[PDB]
Amino acid sequence: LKSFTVEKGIYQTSNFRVQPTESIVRFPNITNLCPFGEVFNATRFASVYAWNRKRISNCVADYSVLYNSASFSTFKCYGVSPTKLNDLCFTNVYADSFVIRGDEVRQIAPGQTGKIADYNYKLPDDFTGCVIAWNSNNLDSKVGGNYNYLYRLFRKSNLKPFERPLQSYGFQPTNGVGYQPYRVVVLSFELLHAPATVCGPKKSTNLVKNKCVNFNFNGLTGTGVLTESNKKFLPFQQFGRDIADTTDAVRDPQTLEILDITPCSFGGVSVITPGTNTSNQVAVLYQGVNCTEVPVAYSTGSNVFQTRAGCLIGAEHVNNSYECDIPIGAGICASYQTSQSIIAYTMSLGAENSVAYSNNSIAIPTNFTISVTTEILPVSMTKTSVDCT
Amino acid sequence: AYTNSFTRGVYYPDKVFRSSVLHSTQDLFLPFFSNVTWFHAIHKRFDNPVLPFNDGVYFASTEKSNIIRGWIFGTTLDSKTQSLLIVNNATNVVIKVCEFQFCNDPFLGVYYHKNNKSWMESEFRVYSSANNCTFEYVSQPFLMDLEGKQGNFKNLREFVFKNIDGYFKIYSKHTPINLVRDLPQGFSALEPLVDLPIGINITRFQTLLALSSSGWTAGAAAYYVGYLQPRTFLLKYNENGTITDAVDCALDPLSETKCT
Amino acid sequence: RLDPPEAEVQIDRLITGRLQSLQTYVTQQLIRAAEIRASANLAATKMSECVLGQSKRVDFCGKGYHLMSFPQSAPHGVVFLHVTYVPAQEKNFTTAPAICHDGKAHFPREGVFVSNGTHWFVTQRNFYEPQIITTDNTFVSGNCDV
Amino acid sequence: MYICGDSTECSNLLLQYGSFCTQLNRALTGIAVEQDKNTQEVFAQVKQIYKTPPIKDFGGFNFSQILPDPSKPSKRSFIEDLLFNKVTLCAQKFNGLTVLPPLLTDEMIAQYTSALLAGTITSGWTFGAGAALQIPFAMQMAYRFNGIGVTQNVLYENQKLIANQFNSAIGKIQDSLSSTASALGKLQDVVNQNAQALNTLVKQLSSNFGAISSVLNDILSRLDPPEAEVQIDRLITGRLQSLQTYVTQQLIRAAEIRASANLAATKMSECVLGQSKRVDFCGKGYHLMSFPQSAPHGVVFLHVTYVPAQEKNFTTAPAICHDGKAHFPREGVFVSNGTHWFVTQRNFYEPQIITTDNTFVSGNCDV
Amino acid sequence: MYICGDSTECSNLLLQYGSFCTQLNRALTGIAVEQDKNTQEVFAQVKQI
Ligand SMILES: *[C@@H]1O[C@H](CO)[C@@H](O[C@@H]2O[C@H](CO)[C@@H](O[C@@H]3O[C@H](CO[C@H]4O[C@H](CO)[C@@H](O)[C@H](O)[C@@H]4O)[C@@H](O)[C@H](O[C@H]4O[C@H](CO)[C@@H](O)[C@H](O)[C@@H]4O)[C@@H]3O)[C@H](O)[C@H]2NC(C)=O)[C@H](O)[C@H]1NC(C)=O
Ligand SMILES: *[C@@H]1O[C@H](CO)[C@@H](O[C@@H]2O[C@H](CO)[C@@H](O[C@@H]3O[C@H](CO)[C@@H](O)[C@H](O[C@H]4O[C@H](CO)[C@@H](O)[C@H](O)[C@@H]4O)[C@@H]3O)[C@H](O)[C@H]2NC(C)=O)[C@H](O)[C@H]1NC(C)=O
Ligand SMILES: *[C@@H]1O[C@H](CO)[C@@H](O[C@@H]2O[C@H](CO)[C@@H](O[C@H]3O[C@H](CO)[C@@H](O)[C@H](O[C@H]4O[C@H](CO)[C@@H](O)[C@H](O)[C@@H]4O)[C@@H]3O)[C@H](O)[C@H]2NC(C)=O)[C@H](O)[C@H]1NC(C)=O
Ligand SMILES: *[C@@H]1O[C@H](CO)[C@@H](O[C@@H]2O[C@H](CO)[C@@H](O[C@@H]3O[C@H](CO)[C@@H](O)[C@H](O)[C@@H]3O)[C@H](O)[C@H]2NC(C)=O)[C@H](O)[C@H]1NC(C)=O
Ligand SMILES: *[C@@H]1O[C@H](CO)[C@@H](O[C@@H]2O[C@H](CO)[C@@H](O[C@@H]3O[C@H](CO)[C@@H](O)[C@H](O)[C@@H]3O)[C@H](O)[C@H]2NC(C)=O)[C@H](O)[C@H]1NC(C)=O
Ligand SMILES: *[C@@H]1O[C@H](CO)[C@@H](O[C@@H]2O[C@H](CO)[C@@H](O[C@@H]3O[C@H](CO)[C@@H](O)[C@H](O)[C@@H]3O)[C@H](O)[C@H]2NC(C)=O)[C@H](O)[C@H]1NC(C)=O
Numbered sequence A: 001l002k003s004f005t006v007e008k009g010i011y012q013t014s015n016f017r018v019q020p021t022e023s024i025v026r027f028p029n030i031t032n033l034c035p036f037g038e039v040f041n042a043t044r045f046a047s048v049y050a051w052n053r054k055r056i057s058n059c060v061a062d063y064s065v066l067y068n069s070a071s072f073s074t075f076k077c078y079g080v081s082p083t084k085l086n087d088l089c090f091t092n093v094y095a096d097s098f099v100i101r102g103d104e105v106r107q108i109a110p111g112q113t114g115k116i117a118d119y120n121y122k123l124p125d126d127f128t129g130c131v132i133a134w135n136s137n138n139l140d141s142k143v144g145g146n147y148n149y150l151y152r153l154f155r156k157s158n159l160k161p162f163e164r165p166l167q168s169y170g171f172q173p174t175n176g177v178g179y180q181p182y183r184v185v186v187l188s189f190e191l192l193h194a195p196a197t198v199c200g201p202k203k204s205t206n207l208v209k210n211k212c213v214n215f216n217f218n219g220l221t222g223t224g225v226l227t228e229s230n231k232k233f234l235p236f237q238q239f240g241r242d243i244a245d246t247t248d249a250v251r252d253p254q255t256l257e258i259l260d261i262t263p264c265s266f267g268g269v270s271v272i273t274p275g276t277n278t279s280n281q282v283a284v285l286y287q288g289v290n291c292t293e294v295p296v297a298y299s300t301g302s303n304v305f306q307t308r309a310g311c312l313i314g315a316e317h318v319n320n321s322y323e324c325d326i327p328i329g330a331g332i333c334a335s336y337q338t339s340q341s342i343i344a345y346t347m348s349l350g351a352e353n354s355v356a357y358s359n360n361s362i363a364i365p366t367n368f369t370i371s372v373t374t375e376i377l378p379v380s381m382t383k384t385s386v387d388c389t
Numbered sequence B: 001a002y003t004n005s006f007t008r009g010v011y012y013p014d015k016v017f018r019s020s021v022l023h024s025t026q027d028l029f030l031p032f033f034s035n036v037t038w039f040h041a042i043h044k045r046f047d048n049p050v051l052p053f054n055d056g057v058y059f060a061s062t063e064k065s066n067i068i069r070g071w072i073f074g075t076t077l078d079s080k081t082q083s084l085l086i087v088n089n090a091t092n093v094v095i096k097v098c099e100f101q102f103c104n105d106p107f108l109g110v111y112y113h114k115n116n117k118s119w120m121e122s123e124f125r126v127y128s129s130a131n132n133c134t135f136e137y138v139s140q141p142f143l144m145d146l147e148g149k150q151g152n153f154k155n156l157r158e159f160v161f162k163n164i165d166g167y168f169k170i171y172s173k174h175t176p177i178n179l180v181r182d183l184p185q186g187f188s189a190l191e192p193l194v195d196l197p198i199g200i201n202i203t204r205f206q207t208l209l210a211l212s213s214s215g216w217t218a219g220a221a222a223y224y225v226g227y228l229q230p231r232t233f234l235l236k237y238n239e240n241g242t243i244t245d246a247v248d249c250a251l252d253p254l255s256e257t258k259c260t
Numbered sequence C: 001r002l003d004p005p006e007a008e009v010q011i012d013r014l015i016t017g018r019l020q021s022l023q024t025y026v027t028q029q030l031i032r033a034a035e036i037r038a039s040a041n042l043a044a045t046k047m048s049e050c051v052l053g054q055s056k057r058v059d060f061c062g063k064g065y066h067l068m069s070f071p072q073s074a075p076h077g078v079v080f081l082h083v084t085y086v087p088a089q090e091k092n093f094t095t096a097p098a099i100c101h102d103g104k105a106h107f108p109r110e111g112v113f114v115s116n117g118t119h120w121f122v123t124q125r126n127f128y129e130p131q132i133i134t135t136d137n138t139f140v141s142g143n144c145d146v
Numbered sequence D: 001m002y003i004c005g006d007s008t009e010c011s012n013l014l015l016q017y018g019s020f021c022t023q024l025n026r027a028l029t030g031i032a033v034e035q036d037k038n039t040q041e042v043f044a045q046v047k048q049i050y051k052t053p054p055i056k057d058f059g060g061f062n063f064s065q066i067l068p069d070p071s072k073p074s075k076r077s078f079i080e081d082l083l084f085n086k087v088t089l090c091a092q093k094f095n096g097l098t099v100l101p102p103l104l105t106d107e108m109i110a111q112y113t114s115a116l117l118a119g120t121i122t123s124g125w126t127f128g129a130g131a132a133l134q135i136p137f138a139m140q141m142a143y144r145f146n147g148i149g150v151t152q153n154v155l156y157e158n159q160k161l162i163a164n165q166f167n168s169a170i171g172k173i174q175d176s177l178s179s180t181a182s183a184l185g186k187l188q189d190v191v192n193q194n195a196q197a198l199n200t201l202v203k204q205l206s207s208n209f210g211a212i213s214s215v216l217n218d219i220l221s222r223l224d225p226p227e228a229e230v231q232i233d234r235l236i237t238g239r240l241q242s243l244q245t246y247v248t249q250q251l252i253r254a255a256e257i258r259a260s261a262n263l264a265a266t267k268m269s270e271c272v273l274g275q276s277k278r279v280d281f282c283g284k285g286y287h288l289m290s291f292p293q294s295a296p297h298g299v300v301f302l303h304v305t306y307v308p309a310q311e312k313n314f315t316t317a318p319a320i321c322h323d324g325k326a327h328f329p330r331e332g333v334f335v336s337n338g339t340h341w342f343v344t345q346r347n348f349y350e351p352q353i354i355t356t357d358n359t360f361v362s363g364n365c366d367v
Numbered sequence E: 001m002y003i004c005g006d007s008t009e010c011s012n013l014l015l016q017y018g019s020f021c022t023q024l025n026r027a028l029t030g031i032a033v034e035q036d037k038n039t040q041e042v043f044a045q046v047k048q049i
């Protein structure tokens, strides 16, 4: 009110909004494969000279089935991260399955040093694959050492990008540290070069109810209160909008069920108080806001009462009826009275009366009075002209 | 024969659930009472032609035994550009996009009871040749009512093929009817079936068949080929979230008032 | 603080804000002007009907029966003094819609019939002024039975 | 909340405009206060709360339909429930918009109408001008007829007939109201228009106003601070435009309805508390009385209008000159069917032989 | 025809601004109806000619 002395009445103030309590995330199960459906998983890989190339499709593109294993020393892509791979959607990934020497792992990296790799696996100028180092000695290990994984490829013609050393008798577990057989698992993939029909994996959280929480359902972010909904969605229907096209009903992606959505309870705050010098005690109420919430943020209360228009605070309910002193709503007004404290009552609509009607009864006035009653009316307001320029 | 639509070509435009709301929508649609060409796939003549794909094509037929095994979506259908394959058997579809070189008659062609009065498979031209590929997939081994069981004609399979901005969808609805004549006066909605953003071009559309047939009895196979158009449709929702009625906003003044 | 080619952009934004405020102010203003003008017409009519002459309209020129009015110039407004007549004390009496004198019904020329309980009288309808029920007070219309 | 719902930087950006929020809330605040004042002003015009006596001996009339029903927990007149039932719409807070319930509730609003009816029937206009004075209804009607230039004898000589017409009329209006619904158009229109305006306001949140999107979080999540600031800035302009427009419409409609409320109050204090002589104001035809009725967001009036029915042509003359002296009627008019001359009331054929008392002398024949 | 007279590009752009003009048409039509209603009520107060 910009004044040190407020008058008797009710005055609006800052609104009250229920704060979010936490966030909750729900997302679906197994999804579509571009990446490493099987390349990272097998007991036998293809030949080094016939380095494998697999097109992978339509199982879960899960790094939670690949990144879960702690065997890999480092799997962190230069351009992306496996942790953030959940949201990322791919177009196609190719599998480089073959067996090479333990010292030839980094030889698979782009711009490698050493011509041993080019003969068996040429490095493309635009490689997006991610070098992954995972223990693979036992899988390729042989009792006498396998020579089948030979590097006899010595074509004199130059080797192009994906157009299609032998210091050990074979791959033996007795080979020294770094000299053991190794298996290359690189997710060589292209994005937007092929049509997108795939997406990555996801993660889920727990479930809550009857709380103002932040919800994410298949990307459906928002804030509100969720509750089990008796509504019956269609088998292929997941979202529910109101007449004004506002989401009200959602279906849990993991467990089939429809949940209601309700905006977090809120409403205006109005302060009831008599004149300052009459008393410094004040009565505060929340408009259309139940006091099931009010202890959020004097929050103790100890003097509360629910009303159709709201659940006020600080005023003591009175079951008698008196003349309205300060309008509140739903036929409730508050006043300061006896020790003196603000009270709330119901409309004493007036002096109940019963005129003695009868068939042959007349009440003629025997006397009169002259009464002068004032009356005021606006006539004109101060004129005003504004010089635009 | 240029037969006329009555109420078909209605499908849910979104997964959104609306109850007791007269939601209005703008999208590719088959205009009410917009008439559609009729094709009778014959077995001495033949009526299995190649038709354009004008950004949304509606299909419907009363066939049986999956005589129309599937369809071909692509640009060239000659392996110059990747082409799709929709051939479906009693088990499932084998959706396939590859640089595929087809043939003049690239369908399996079960010519049962045709000439020698028996069952046989004289060719397997479905896989003419897949010179090279970019993606392939076989849907879940379901069992949908595609085999031969007429009884009272109920195999009213409606297909709408929408491939917008790289997302390709499939809406259909098994429509059990009792009238064996031209499309009955009924209202139904094609529920979404599958989305597969194959991203390929499509501007042409040859269907597939399952059955030198000179003198052989004609083929009791018939179907419609409608084309959706971008139109504003006033759509109804009952208490269920099911489309009970629909109205076009440009068919006639009376309907426009409803839309307005 | 800024060279010309970008300074107008900052100026342009301010123009929109100030101009928008004027519209809000001006748009808000004349709405009140219509309201007060509507109120003014109400006041003018009250002056014409409650001051220049007595008005029979009930409660329009003050509570209760209206006798006259007096205005008073006030800053930007007008103040009226509604001199009103109000009955004070009433003692109720038994009555009768008509009097059967000699087989012919009687009704008052004006007023109303009333009785202390023994005799009967007729008096005006807004102040107890009993009078003997004579022929001049009343008039004949029909017979008693109806 | 509506503009920058749960977005601090969005709210911080809006602070540039600053005070705009305060005025808009104040404008609405005034409107809300006006609504309660209007309803209270038109209805709460009785100092006491009178009650209808149990003995309904109103000279043969029945008012059961308009009288409250004690058995009904909501002590509303039967018509009121009919009016309440006919009015049919949801609307709840979603994005900051809220609805403040009216200060008064239909339960007590009904009491005003109940008390007003009792005072009217049991005391006529006396309670309007001050202390309520009981008056038998039959006599009260006679006063009304005197107001419209009809002598009391007419009412009493045909009291039974009038009761049947009045009771039948009340019965008739019920069925008319129950059958058709176009009567409630005005009240229904206000709700629909008011509800319609809110819907459009909410829908405007979906428009991008030339921005990348209409979802503030989406813009915030994607774009970096500088670019995101520009996008939201435009969104603030568009959203702010919608609010000030809607509030303006609310102000105008509130301005219109307020005038209607004042008109209702003028009818309320004149067509009910008194017998207005304004032709066609309190219903078509001559006016006798009125009965208010509480309806949602509005009020319903029951004018009781007198209407002449059957007419017979007569031969008249301005005056009569008896002995060289002209005679003028004290009231009414001279009329002869063609054989004798009669004087009768101005609005009912009640022939009476012309006599000295009924006339007065002035001038002579020639003038 | 006032804002984006005969320009689909202009017509598409205003669509991003909600349906502001739609309210304007409704208000204007309401004004037009009021005029006809006003004229009828003030004059046509007697049915018989
Ligand atoms: C409502 O009001 C009164 C109720 O009392 C009724 O009218 C009254 O009736 C009585 C009798 O008719 C009137 O009494 C009159 O009093 C006069 C004054 O002297 C009185 O006091 C002395 C004191 O010693 C007594 O000795 C004396 O007897 C009186 O009691 C007397 O002078 C009167 O006597 C004679 O004159 C009057 C008038 O000429 C006659 O009517 C008498 O019959 C008697 O011959 C008389 O006694 C009293 O004044 C009346 N008051 C009124 C009219 O206001 C009404 O009937 C009642 N109204 C209705 C409609 O019913
Ligand atoms: C969408 O919801 C509607 C229901 O409004 C549903 O259409 C069917 O309509 C009837 C009523 O209109 C539904 O029956 C009602 O609900 C139950 C089940 O029927 C009962 O309380 C009542 O029916 C009883 O009485 C019938 C008398 O013949 C019995 O036959 C019956 O078995 C019950 O005992 C009441 O009338 C009916 O449930 C729905 N059908 C279904 C499947 O809900 C429509 O089918 C629903 N569609 C979807 C996709 O949800
Ligand atoms: C215009 O109005 C006139 C109203 O007076 C009409 O004249 C009257 O017509 C009636 C016809 O019934 C007549 O009454 C006759 O019958 C009555 C039955 O009770 C009786 O009471 C009447 O007695 C009167 O007349 C006799 C003489 O015959 C007198 O001795 C009586 O004292 C009494 O006055 C009666 O005859 C009315 O009498 C008669 N009124 C007069 C003054 O004559 C006109 O007919 C009518 N004209 C037109 C063109 O409409
Ligand atoms: C995705 O993976 C989860 C992993 O469980 C699947 O969970 C579904 O929901 C709950 C999870 O606790 C399970 O249902 C339970 O079934 C038992 C059977 O005895 C029953 O007693 C419980 O009351 C509860 O219903 C179950 O794992 C599974 N529910 C099913 C299959 O009906 C989930 O189904 C997987 N699929 C999707 C789309 O999320
Ligand atoms: C807070 O607001 C609500 C009004 O919406 C008031 O309490 C509500 O009253 C009923 C009865 O308890 C509850 O409905 C149902 O009650 C049954 C009782 O068995 C219960 O089993 C159901 O789960 C359901 O609650 C309703 O939930 C309840 N809502 C609440 C408490 O939020 C209440 O007056 C208000 N709190 C106050 C005034 O402190
Ligand atoms: C008073 O107003 C009431 C109506 O509010 C009038 O009372 C009428 O009385 C009759 C007989 O009770 C009712 O007729 C029928 O009564 C039977 C038995 O209850 C019932 O089953 C029928 O459906 C029908 O109601 C009638 O309903 C009722 N209303 C009307 C319009 O006639 C009465 O005419 C008024 N006058 C008096 C002196 O009460």
Ligand SMILES: *[C@@H]1O[C@H](CO[C@@H]2O[C@@H](C)[C@@H](O)[C@@H](O)[C@@H]2O)[C@@H](O[C@@H]2O[C@H](CO)[C@@H](O)[C@H](O)[C@H]2NC(C)=O)[C@H](O)[C@H]1NC(C)=O
Pocket: A356, A361, A363, C091, C092, C093, C094
């Ligand atoms: C009105 O008079 C009544 C009773 O007075 C008697 O009877 C009258 C008809 C009249 O003839 C008087 O001169 C008589 O002395 C007063 O008492 C009321 O009576 C009615 C029932 O008869 C009853 O319902 C009321 O409750 C009674 N009220 C009181 C205070 O006793 C009544 O006070 C007088 N005033 C009014 C406004 O009615």
Ligand SMILES: *[C@@H]1O[C@H](CO[C@@H]2O[C@@H](C)[C@@H](O)[C@@H](O)[C@@H]2O)[C@@H](O[C@@H]2O[C@H](CO)[C@@H](O)[C@H](O)[C@H]2NC(C)=O)[C@H](O)[C@H]1NC(C)=O
Pocket: D311, D312, D313
């Ligand atoms: C009253 O009379 C007029 C006309 O007088 C009628 O004709 C006279 C010759 C004589 O017989 C009178 O008693 C009659 O009443 C009526 O008006 C005419 O009615 C006729 C049909 O009856 C019609 O052809 C005319 O157009 C009407 N107008 C005129 C100027 O003649 C009138 O109906 C009567 N009104 C009442 C209330 O009785």
Ligand SMILES: *[C@@H]1O[C@H](CO)[C@@H](O[C@@H]2O[C@H](CO)[C@@H](O)[C@H](O)[C@H]2NC(C)=O)[C@H](O)[C@H]1NC(C)=O
Pocket: B087, B088, B089, B090, B091, B092, B093, B094
């Ligand atoms: C149509 O012919 C039979 C019917 O089941 C299937 O053809 C092969 O079925 C076996 C499994 O029994 C699969 O291993 C083959 O891959 C199927 N062949 C092909 C080309 O897919 C098949 O179900 C039907 N053909 C389909 C679905 O394309």
Ligand SMILES: *[C@@H]1O[C@H](CO)[C@@H](O)[C@H](O)[C@H]1NC(C)=O
Pocket: A041, A042, A043
């Ligand atoms: C794939 O991973 C599983 C679980 O870690 C493992 O048991 C298995 O050895 C791997 N599959 C093959 C064929 O090696």
Ligand SMILES: *[C@@H]1O[C@H](CO)[C@@H](O)[C@H](O)[C@H]1NC(C)=O
Pocket: A006, A007, A008, A274, A275, A276, A277, A278
């Ligand atoms: C302050 O005190 C006196 C009463 O003693 C007074 O006139 C005034 O009403 C009080 N302040 C208010 C807001 O009432």
Ligand SMILES: *[C@@H]1O[C@H](CO)[C@@H](O)[C@H](O)[C@H]1NC(C)=O
Pocket: A317, A318, A319, A320
């Ligand atoms: C008030 O009085 C009523 C009597 O009906 C009683 O039910 C109620 O408990 C009382 N409440 C208080 C606070 O006195």
Ligand SMILES: *[C@@H]1O[C@H](CO)[C@@H](O)[C@H](O)[C@H]1NC(C)=O
Pocket: B001, B002, B003, B004, B035, B036
């Ligand atoms: C099909 O549509 C066009 C235009 O309505 C019409 O000219 C033609 O006759 C129609 N033919 C059939 C079979 O509907």
Ligand SMILES: *[C@@H]1O[C@H](CO)[C@@H](O)[C@H](O)[C@H]1NC(C)=O
Pocket: B111, B112, B113, B114, B115, B116, B117, B120, B122
């Ligand atoms: C029937 O059998 C003969 C045997 O060769 C074959 O030539 C002929 O094509 C068959 N007819 C059909 C319709 O398959």
Ligand SMILES: *[C@@H]1O[C@H](CO)[C@@H](O)[C@H](O)[C@H]1NC(C)=O
Pocket: B099, B131, B132, B133, B134
């Ligand atoms: C398929 O093989 C061809 C020809 O050798 C080659 O050009 C192309 O890269 C491969 N992929 C296709 C045609 O999709």
Ligand SMILES: *[C@@H]1O[C@H](CO)[C@@H](O)[C@H](O)[C@H]1NC(C)=O
Pocket: B075, B200, B201, B202, B203
């Ligand atoms: C499809 O888009 C690709 C990309 O340019 C192009 O190669 C092809 O010719 C297009 N074909 C059609 C029918 O649009």
